[PDB]
Amino acid sequence: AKKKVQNITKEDVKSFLRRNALLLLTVLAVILGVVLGFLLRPYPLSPREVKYFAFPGELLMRMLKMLILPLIVSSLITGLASLDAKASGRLGMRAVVYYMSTTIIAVVLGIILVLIIHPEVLDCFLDLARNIFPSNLVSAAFRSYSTQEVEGMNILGLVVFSMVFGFALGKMGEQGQLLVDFFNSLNEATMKLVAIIMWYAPLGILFLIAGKIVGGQLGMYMVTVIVGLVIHGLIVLPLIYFLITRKNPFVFIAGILQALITALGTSSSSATLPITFKCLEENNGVDKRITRFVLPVGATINMDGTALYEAVAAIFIAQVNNYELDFGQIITISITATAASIGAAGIPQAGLVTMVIVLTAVGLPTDDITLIIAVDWLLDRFRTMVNVLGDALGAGIVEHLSRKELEKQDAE
Amino acid sequence: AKKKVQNITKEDVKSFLRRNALLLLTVLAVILGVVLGFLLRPYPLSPREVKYFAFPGELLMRMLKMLILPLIVSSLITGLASLDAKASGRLGMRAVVYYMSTTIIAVVLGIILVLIIHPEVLDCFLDLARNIFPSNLVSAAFRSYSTQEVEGMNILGLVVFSMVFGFALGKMGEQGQLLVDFFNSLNEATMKLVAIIMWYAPLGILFLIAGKIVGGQLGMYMVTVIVGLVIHGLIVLPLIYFLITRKNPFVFIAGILQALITALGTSSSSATLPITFKCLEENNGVDKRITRFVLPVGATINMDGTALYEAVAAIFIAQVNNYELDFGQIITISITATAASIGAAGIPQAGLVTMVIVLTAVGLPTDDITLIIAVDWLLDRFRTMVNVLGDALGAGIVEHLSRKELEKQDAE
Amino acid sequence: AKKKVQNITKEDVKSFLRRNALLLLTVLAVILGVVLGFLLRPYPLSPREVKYFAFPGELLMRMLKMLILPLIVSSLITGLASLDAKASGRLGMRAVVYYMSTTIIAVVLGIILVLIIHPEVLDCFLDLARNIFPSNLVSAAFRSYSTQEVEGMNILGLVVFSMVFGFALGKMGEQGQLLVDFFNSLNEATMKLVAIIMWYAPLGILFLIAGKIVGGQLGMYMVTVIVGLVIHGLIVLPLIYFLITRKNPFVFIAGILQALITALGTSSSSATLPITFKCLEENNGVDKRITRFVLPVGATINMDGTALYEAVAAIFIAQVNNYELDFGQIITISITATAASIGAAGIPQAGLVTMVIVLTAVGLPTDDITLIIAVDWLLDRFRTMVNVLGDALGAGIVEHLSRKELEKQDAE
């Protein structure tokens, strides 16, 4: 009742409109995009014509994807070279502990919400191990292994190599410094390009979401995850940030708002990574030393929203199948949904492809994934926002916990 | 009558032979190549054997293509970082204005010469836009998009990215300088390699042209463009250079002679770019700051000879078809032939592939391109020389017009 | 009798076990690998399951292959920039003379051993020439030409380009130094990663050899080459090193032992190159200036063991065919087996693929290669050890012969 009477003052909206021009434009892009897409929905237009329509949104995807490679490689090489090897292990343990806990908490919340509301696989593990260790760095930049090398950048392989290379340069001293300085100039220069890409974003988001918007049991399921992601995203994660930092978490979420709205549009944790960087480094004022450490790793392994969706959908398909509830086999679901969360790449429709792991483990048929394909796209847009939000709050949490190591490196 | 009596003095030919050793060798390579090719023309030898024969000319192509990538990327990153953002816009406006005017003048001359002597397409625009914004920089270095990613370097995508990256580094100051210095050493080092490639050029040009030389209406057509390119190339463009600089243009053409003779052999504006660089920077003494700005851009968009050929061939196929002459539809030909000129890549047989755009716009059948395929190769060799000559004179024109901006950067 | 009574002292084995922990572990990996492979040999397991089994050995291959590219490119660019152009020709002549002589001596020894114990092709030359001059440097990093561009790094193309680039930077002075320093930091940093890869090697070698171990005339043939490689490897090459340096060669072989045991496991001169570098630079204390000069070149052209195997197998298939012994045609075998040695890439099963050249030249049928395929893998493991051992002793021989040039560069 106190904040309500405070809200009626009609104070400073002209200053807000002037400052938040771009932020409000992308919000308007979502509003206009939903309106346009539903207006143009009666489709006497072929999928070829759908591709033609969504083209302005496609150029935004090419623009964002462009920067992913120089962004990850320069961030981890400089970031890990900036820190002392032992401090990097400390920072790393903070990240890993935060990642596993938040993913374990999301999968438990996900299982509880479905148990209340009733709405080869070995080759996958070897392909993952194969990608952690790329045989060629030039090819790793635009191809991933799939048992033989499918198209699309091997983010994980580059994440791992850049880290080991970063540690090596840190151990080289002065001889190493030249290369650390080379990669620092390349990071800031690609960060300077994401400033340009940001002005195109409202035009892109409008067309990217408008194009995608062009039995009843699958209906209740969509409502389950959406509710589950609001509990984790807007209630679980903020109180975690508040409990650790003692800072207002909803003001932090306001800073990374452009990153969430772009995640909602692209449905890629990797594509929105350059914008998550711009938001945290600037708007939230997070340290570059730790955003370069947390964000490229969080974008591929820290998938809180995917984990919640993996558990929900693994139990949802079992409802139709009338599969028996085993006290020990539900434990395998929480284990494999956390496993698939880490595994699944930060790219669209990667959630559904990793369901093969979680469906096999329990003993459910993998061909049931076909039922969940139709509605997936909308749940993917939301799942991505929670996967990004986790890396953003994760950076804020780690930065706060690692202030001693950061103050030592600020000596000179 | 005064220059004629002056020419009879038999003075300084031994000094000319000693100095112009390489220049005269490549001229002799064309003379020996035409003789050898016609001598070996009776072909009881398969296309496989033709490939075997033309192999010394193939090694020259691999050698020149090799350097294109480090040459474009280092030239635009340093070149645009060297200049103040506002001066880069001034230099840019001079280039764009020169490019569009010369291309508009060539297409008008081309249309006049044919109207006196009577001898999907949307997917193309989207593919071009897609290539201006590459989704992966490593893949952009050896692949282009074609609706899905065909082989062959995306020169345009790299031209655009290098420019935006160059502007970014220029805005970084000292932090940026390291990377600008890194790309400056990489430019001069690859420029040092083109000095070596130049000694192989006479052997390559000989075999490259000899291999290619191994109804009657298509006969008069070939004579139309050849005459049209001599009017534009040796009369239109030199008087433009003279009107702007007041310097003798045929002495400038003498400096870039090795670049034209290599264009005549390869039929690629991109492949002869490292040699156009060596000729302008040295022989013509043009500024590196502006050759790095003009030449990589001119090689892909400034296609004067292609534009003249596009107009000539669009009207030539209509002669056979007896297609009606519309005052407003000839205006669409001048517009789409200028459009295709900009579009068409600086690689062999790219002129004929972009005829699809100009034939569709008017309302002529695209399957008529098959008639023009046989004679094309020879017209392509000449068209390329005019496309290169335009970038060479264009550099000389811009350098002269931008002497104030260049004198400011020479302060220290 | 003097070294025998000296060996009975039971002195310093605890110091040896502590120091040579890793060296003895990889030896134990071979012992355990042979035992495990023969134990698991009864195969009710498919080739798919064989791939699953050999997976720890596959990760070692991806790890070693990863570093090959930054290792070759940084070694030759810095190495050749470090030296004066004339000194590089001197060092080069020492290498080339050593390479051709040792390969000529191995093929002569190989021919003698078989003549005592009786147990298109033009397209190949053009493909080699095409690869010496790559048309694209980014593609050269992960593809080779095959008449059109097959997968797998073009080591030769990068070896050649890095050398020409190294010479260019050396001729640039100070402007060049930045890039030389850039590539020096990148060499030491990738050399710092091979230290990590080395700890995985015993686990990898165990599984790499165990997986591969899972008429009678082809039996005697295998014994011929194995004996021939022991004569060249353990008798011919050491006395050559002793005659040149006057240093004990079997103490040198002890230093590069990890490199030979890894060659025995991988059967790739290129994959074991980062470990041959670590052994020579450290264990044998060879100069970085010359290991960067000798080793990347030796890994592809200096194939002593392959040459001996090429001669042995070219004459062995003629035994079955009862092909006539011509005094002049045996001279063509020694010539083409030396030719194929240089040609054949430092990768597994490359020896048998280049037999096409040596079988055609004499007049034997190329389809006979099928008979030698079954036993090849084991002979390849040994052939590789002799191909590596040659580069290792070659570095030691060149370093010793070039001490004047090295002492001049140590001035400052």
Ligand SMILES: COc1ccc([C@@H]2C(C#N)=C(N)OC3=C2C(=O)C[C@@H](c2cccc4ccccc24)C3)cc1
């Ligand atoms: C596969 O998914 C990953 C990769 C990385 C991480 C952690 C992380 C984050 N966020 C980053 N930036 O660096 C390190 C991490 C460590 O736990 C360990 C830490 C580390 C400390 C000290 C020395 C190291 C040497 C090499 C590599 C990592 C090292 C680096 C977690 C999961």
Ligand SMILES: COc1ccc([C@@H]2C(C#N)=C(N)OC3=C2C(=O)C[C@@H](c2cccc4ccccc24)C3)cc1
């Ligand atoms: C697609 O085909 C092209 C690309 C480039 C150009 C012009 C050109 C030439 N020649 C070069 N080297 O740079 C710039 C040009 C401009 O007009 C604008 C100019 C510019 C000035 C100031 C800031 C900029 C920031 C980013 C990019 C270009 C900028 C750069 C013309 C057509």
Ligand SMILES: COc1ccc([C@@H]2C(C#N)=C(N)OC3=C2C(=O)C[C@@H](c2cccc4ccccc24)C3)cc1
């Ligand atoms: C295709 O297989 C090869 C490539 C290289 C070599 C020799 C070698 C070794 N080992 C290395 N590192 O460099 C040079 C070699 C020369 O003989 C010549 C030497 C050289 C000296 C002076 C100037 C040069 C300029 C460019 C290239 C090589 C040059 C370089 C032999 C065979």
Ligand SMILES: N[C@@H](CC(=O)O)C(=O)O
């Ligand atoms: N598309 C999601 C991952 C998923 O498909 O679950 C993301 O990039 O965050």
Ligand SMILES: N[C@@H](CC(=O)O)C(=O)O
């Ligand atoms: N081959 C020409 C372009 C064309 O095909 O018209 C050039 O590169 O200049």
Ligand SMILES: N[C@@H](CC(=O)O)C(=O)O
């Ligand atoms: N595999 C051998 C070459 C060969 O196949 O003969 C090596 O790399 O040394």
Ligand SMILES: [Ba+2]
């Ligand atoms: Ba430091």
Ligand SMILES: [Ba+2]
């Ligand atoms: Ba400056």
Ligand SMILES: [Ba+2]
């Ligand atoms: Ba020096």
Ligand code: NA
């Ligand atoms: Na998590």
Ligand code: NA
């Ligand atoms: Na993520």
Ligand code: NA
């Ligand atoms: Na993941």
Ligand code: NA
């Ligand atoms: Na023009």
Ligand code: NA
């Ligand atoms: Na051009």
Ligand code: NA
């Ligand atoms: Na063009």
Ligand code: NA
């Ligand atoms: Na040899």
